[PDB]
Structure 1
Amino acid sequence: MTSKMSQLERNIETIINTFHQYSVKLGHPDTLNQGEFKELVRKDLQNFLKKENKNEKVIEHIFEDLDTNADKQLSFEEFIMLMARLTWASHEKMHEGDEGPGHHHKPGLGEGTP
């Protein structure tokens, strides 16, 4: 019974609100153009994107790549994908399957009689 939300909850609202403010101003609220994408990362992550700032082409490359519709805009789902892609490419991996001892098995029933 807690009336105070965790720090994580606050962050969720902050992320949604921040994108909404920039997005609503320009283009559809649920989509981001190249200008908004660059602006959001530059102001929020100027230190992390210092190298990105030097290469303008590098920055537009990722945005366009993430846009599957080639509509020069990214969907909400597409936007979060971009962040994940930046952190790690995540190459496709395959596994044969799951296996293990299986903890043997339960005992059978004697089914004996008096």
Structure 2
Amino acid sequence: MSQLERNIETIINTFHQYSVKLGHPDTLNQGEFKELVRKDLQNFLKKENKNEKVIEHIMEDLDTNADKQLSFEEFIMLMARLTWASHEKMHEGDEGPGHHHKPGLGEG
């Protein structure tokens, strides 16, 4: 299994660990999303986790079809956005020469 495949599996397995708890087994309701963010994204969303209204807005923004659940398809955009945001932070104020990563999201 490639590294990339392993990472995608981690995303899928994490999502489903929470999505099966309550209601529809393939979507996260607000309760399930908040728990995932609180624990599994405790460093990447450290500041956001301090304001429950920010977390709820994040879910509202990701809830593409507006049904108050996150499908895996909607959720994976959060994964892409946070991966993007971590990489952006590793390059904040980058002067070169060459390529170097500062600490990413939730670090430093």
In the superposition, the TM-score normalised over structure 1's length comes to 0.61
Gap change, CA 1:94 and 1:26, over 3 Å in 2 = closer
How much has 1:10 moved relative to structure 2?
2.2
How much has 1:51 moved relative to structure 2?
0.8
Gap change, CA 1:53 and 1:104, over 3 Å in 2 = closer
Match of 1:76 in 2: 72
**Whole-angstrom CA distance in 2 between matches of 1:10 and 1:81:** 18
How much has 1:7 moved relative to structure 2?
2.6
Q: Give the structure with the higher percent helix.
A: 2
Runs of 4+, deviation exceeding 4 Å: 85-112
Gap change, CA 1:93 and 1:51, over 3 Å in 2 = closer
User: For the aligned residues, what is the CA RMSD?
Assistant: 14.4
Give the stretch that moved more between structures: 100-109 or 13-22: 100-109
How much has 1:86 moved relative to structure 2?
5.1
How much has 1:16 moved relative to structure 2?
1.4
How much has 1:107 moved relative to structure 2?
55
How much has 1:9 moved relative to structure 2?
2.3
The size of the alignment, in residue pairs, is 108
* Identity in percent: 99
**Whole-angstrom CA distance in 1 between matches of 2:52 and 2:103:** 69
Give the stretch that moved more between structures: 59-68 or 96-105: 96-105
**Whole-angstrom CA distance in 1 between matches of 2:58 and 2:31:** 13
Of the two, which has the highest radius of gyration? Answer: 1
How much has 1:14 moved relative to structure 2?
2.2
In the superposition, the TM-score normalised over structure 2's length comes to 0.64
Give the stretch that moved more between structures: 90-99 or 63-72: 90-99
**5 Å matches for 1:62-73?**
62-73=58-69
Show CA shifts across 1:51-104 (max 9, x none): 112211011011112223321112221111233345669999999999999999
